[PDB]
Amino acid sequence: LNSINTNPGALLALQNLNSTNTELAATQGRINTGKKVANAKDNGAIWSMAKMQS
Amino acid sequence: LNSINTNPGALLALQNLNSTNTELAATQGRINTGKKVANAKDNGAIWSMAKMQS
């Protein structure tokens, strides 16, 4: 409301900005490595099939 | 009535001014702290709830 101690709106805006930052970091990863699933964290199943294929 | 030893009306005026002074002090606390339940005396149940939540 009119609270001075805690304002929710900065918290919501920071959550949105943090989501934007994480997805931007994911695009930075996909760009710098050229691989949509560069490691097991991206997708363990597809990464395992690709590792056996390689 | 016409007594000079004591005048009740001044006592009632002092009582109303004291009530105004307590309301003003409560407003000063609500302003400088920013909390309507800053301590246990404002409301013990809401204060304990907020304390456990924090």
The contacts of residue B47 (CB under 8 Å, 6+ apart) are: B37, B39, B40
Three-state SS string across chain B, please?
CCCCCCCHHHHHHHHHHHHHHHHHHHHHHHHHHCCCCCCCCCCHHHHHHHHHHC
Under DSSP, the state recorded for A40 is T
Asked whether the beta carbons of A48 and A40 are under 8 A apart, the reply is yes
Q: Tell me the two tokens of residue A12.
A: 């919501």
- Burial bucket for residue A52 (CB in 10 Å: 0-12, 13-18, 19+): exposed
Q: Which helix (H) or strand (E) holds A1?
A: none
Experimental technique, in short, is cryo-EM
Which chain B residues contact residue A3 at CB under 8 A? Answer: 34
Q: Comparing C-alpha atoms, which of B38, B40, B47 is closest to residue A3?
A: B38
| Residue the block writes with tokens 């009535």 | B1
Using an 8 Å CB-CB cutoff, list chain B residues near A5.
Answer: 34-35
- List chain A residues with CB under 8 Å of B34: 3-5
The one-letter amino acid code at B21 reads: N
Which residues, 6 or more positions from A29, have their beta carbon under 8 angstroms from its beta carbon?
Answer: A38
Residue B39 exposure: Cα atoms within 13 Å on the Cβ side: 5
CA atoms within 13 Å, Cβ hemisphere of A10: 5
The first and second tokens of residue A28, run together, are 């930075």
Q: State the smallest CA–CA distance between residue B7 and chain A in angstroms.
A: 46
